[PDB]
Design a protein around this ligand. Structure first.
Ligand code: RKR
Ligand code: RKR
Ligand code: CL
Lengths: 298, 305
């Protein structure tokens, strides 16, 4: 029993974190095989013009107490790839994957190439992440683990004026309409991840919290008309299908759980909590709920 | 900016997790140097749990009855001893991945990271706090026994908890790494219930200072209070008493934000009376008590927004 915001074990990623220094800027790099990946703003913009002026020895890469030798450099979108003379002996089995808004991942926050903490978060529908990052955190990475393979999905680049964070996949493509430069950029209006709130309501039922259940059902169209009014993302048939296993386990149809959610939006919690929360939680996917209520190991 | 429930990186602990098997029971062990630490109830059957005589059950076992598996490698047990509610299995191989470590016993209100494990394989990491009633609100399924709680301030792992059991309310009970239980619990299937839980007042105050550091001041007021008047009001909402030690510990956060501890106590009193009125504090609609003053200083910026 119990339900916590759980991150993947970070060990396989900790063994890849390095410190990258260029001039006065120090940030984090990800060392996989003989390449160190880091945000291209470490050279700071006309990034090709700034990069052409740099030589290999201008990039100082430190792995623990060992200085790595940079033997080449190239840029891929907003990510700088530093070829080093030593392959990381701790390189895990890995993939670079681009995630969708609503999907969750673990973040290993780092400063000076040293991991300081791990937390779980979700890619918001406005493509920002509500992270916890201070100056020096750039280059910290987001990941998921499937079996023994680490899927790297995020690299931290910047903090927006509202305190939320923006970054790229490991191929340097930003999530959201953001650019790596000091300009007037703002996070768009955010919405609630509906399929994740539904998954969290199923987790609450599995853990013995059923006060919000009712005898009613709804159509997908009527639910979406209600959901649009409360700044909730539309629920698609794909979301209904994905919630199938949780529906079969608890005996509560997806549209029956939607009728519970509709009543919670229209009337509130009335002084009650669900899984120790007074707000509807949207940072657990249906897969996260099934995994945490089954004990899958890595 | 931002404020998350943050756990320590778990790598140094993952390299210590092993699977311990005795008869039909399989649970987790912590392999440090040449010793595997695990809950002594691994030697029990479910029938034995009502009134187990661990000394009588242990004397009947030999080294080769304990199967220890580290990854895909079987370790050889060359000795065994019991220390309180933990079993210490001497093995013939020292763990090459043994980090710099200490065994520390924590007090209620202290936080720590938990690496939940099944069959010696880590599945997840989360942050939690030792409740005032000595239980932890964890997330554990069957097979999680032996999973450990820890802190990693600098490069040294301080092990503070080993998971032993789940109480009827769904909360969890366990021991320090010397086998002494936190709370009035026993590793026995008997009528045991968690005592009435309370809110960790000093942690809620630390979290209110974190909110001010991050730029939010809506909950502040023009009042102050005495420590005694604050405690009289706090006890009525099931909040732990705030001691002079707690006031002293909050000193640095008070100096950084410019808000006296008893001035922040007056804001908390008002929050308890009024509720949040549709507002949130650091993205939460409830008063959060699982961040210590030390956690806030470690996570938050040194410059107040
Ligand atoms: C310095 N400061 C108070 C913080 C605090 C917190 C910060 C958290 N994350 C990242 C930071 N870094 C940046 O956003 C630097 C930056 C500026 C312009 C463009 C880009 Cl791509 C990157 C933080 C910076
Ligand atoms: C079996 N099951 C549904 C769960 C679920 C969840 C569980 C979470 N933690 C531990 C479990 N294990 C125990 O509490 C076994 C036990 C029983 C009586 C006394 C002792 Cl010392 C140990 C869990 C067991
Ligand atoms: Cl302590």
């Amino acid at each position: 029993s119990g339900f916590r915001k759980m991150a993947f074990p970070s060990g396989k990623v900790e063994g890849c974190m390095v410190q990258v220094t260029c001039g006065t800027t120090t940030l984090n790099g990800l060392w996989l095989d003989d390449v160190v990946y880091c945000p291209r703003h470490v050279i700071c913009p006309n990034y090709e013009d700034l990069l052409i002026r740099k030589s290999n020895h201008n990039f100082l890469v430190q792995a623990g107490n060992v200085q790595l030798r940079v033997i080449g450099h190239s840029m891929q979108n907003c990510v700088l790839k530093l070829k080093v003379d030593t392959a990381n002996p701790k390189t895990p089995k890995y993939k670079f994957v681009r995630i969708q808004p609503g999907q969750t991942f673990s973040v290993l926050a780092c400063y000076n190439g040293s991991p300081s903490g791990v937390y779980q978060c979700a890619m918001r529908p406005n493509f920002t992440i509500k992270g916890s990052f201070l100056n020096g955190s750039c280059g910290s990475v987001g990941f998921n683990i499937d079996y023994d393979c680490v899927s790297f999905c995020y690299m931290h680049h910047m903090e927006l004026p509202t305190g939320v964070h923006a970054g790229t996949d490991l191929e340097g493509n930003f999530y959201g309409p953001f650019v790596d430069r000091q300009t007037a950029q703002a996070a768009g209006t955010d919405t609630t991840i509906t399929v994740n709130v539904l998954a969290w309501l199923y987790a609450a039922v599995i853990n013995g919290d059923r006060w919000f259940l009712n005898r009613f059902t709804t159509t997908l169209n009527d639910f979406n008309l209600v959901a649009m009014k409360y700044n909730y993302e539309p629920l698609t048939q794909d979301h209904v299908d994905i919630l199938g296993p949780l529906s079969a386990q608890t005996g509560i149809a997806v549209l029956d759980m939607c009728a519970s959610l509709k009543e919670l939006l229209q009337n509130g919690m009335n002084g009650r909590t669900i899984l120790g929360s007074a707000l509807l939680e949207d940072e657990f996917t249906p897969f996260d709920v099934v995994r945490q209520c089954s004990g899958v190991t890595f």
